[PDB]
Amino acid sequence: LSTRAGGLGINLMTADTVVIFDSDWNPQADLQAMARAHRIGQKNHVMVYR
DNA sequence: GGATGTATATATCTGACACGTGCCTGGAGACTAGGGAGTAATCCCCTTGGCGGTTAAAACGCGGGGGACAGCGCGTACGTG
């Protein structure tokens, strides 16, 4: 993913781990990026490697 | 025996150089003020990398026909003496 694309409607339920290669200046973009996979109904424990 | 081509010596031209001279303009020395270098603050404009959405402009393909170009004639206007 490019971090600032796709809006808030991207559904990524099947993924488990999120790796942030480049840290954003705005942390809310990173929170939205990790909430792409941490949506309601996720069946796995999500970890983020920065 | 008369006439002809070449070789060293002296007078004259001719630009360049040594010397003379004026004078005026550039250089040496001193002083000063101000123009520019440096510093700090503030705020607006520009840079590089991204995103989203509109949409009008750009790209591509194809028919066809108008125009560029080649060939030929001619007669006149310009070259030449």
What can you see in these coordinates?
This protein is α+β, with helices and mostly antiparallel strands and 50 residues long. Helix content is 18%, strand content 12%. It is built from one helix and two strands. It has one helix at 27-35; strands at 17-19, 47-49. A two-stranded parallel ribbon has the order 1-2. The longest helix has 9 residues, at 27-35. The two termini are 14 Å apart. The chain binds one DNA strand of 81 nucleotides through residues 2-7.
Secondary structure layout plus pairing:
Blueprint: E1 17-19, H1 27-35, E2 47-49
Parallel strand pairs: 1-2
The structure holds one DNA strand of 81 nucleotides.
- Rg is 10 Å
Q: How many DSSP E strands?
A: 2
Please list the strands of the largest sheet in the order they lie side by side.
Answer: 1-2
Shape: globular
* C-alpha termini separation: 14 Å
Largest sheet: 2 strands, parallel
Structural class: alpha+beta
Helical content band: 10-25%
Quaternary organisation of the protein chains: part of a larger assembly
Order of helices and strands: EHE
**What's the number of helices?**
1
Binned strand content: 5-15%
Summarize the structure.
With 50 residues, the chain is an alpha+beta fold.
Attribute tags:
part of a larger assembly, 1 chains, 50 residues, alpha+beta, two-stranded parallel ribbon, 2 strands, globular, DNA-binding
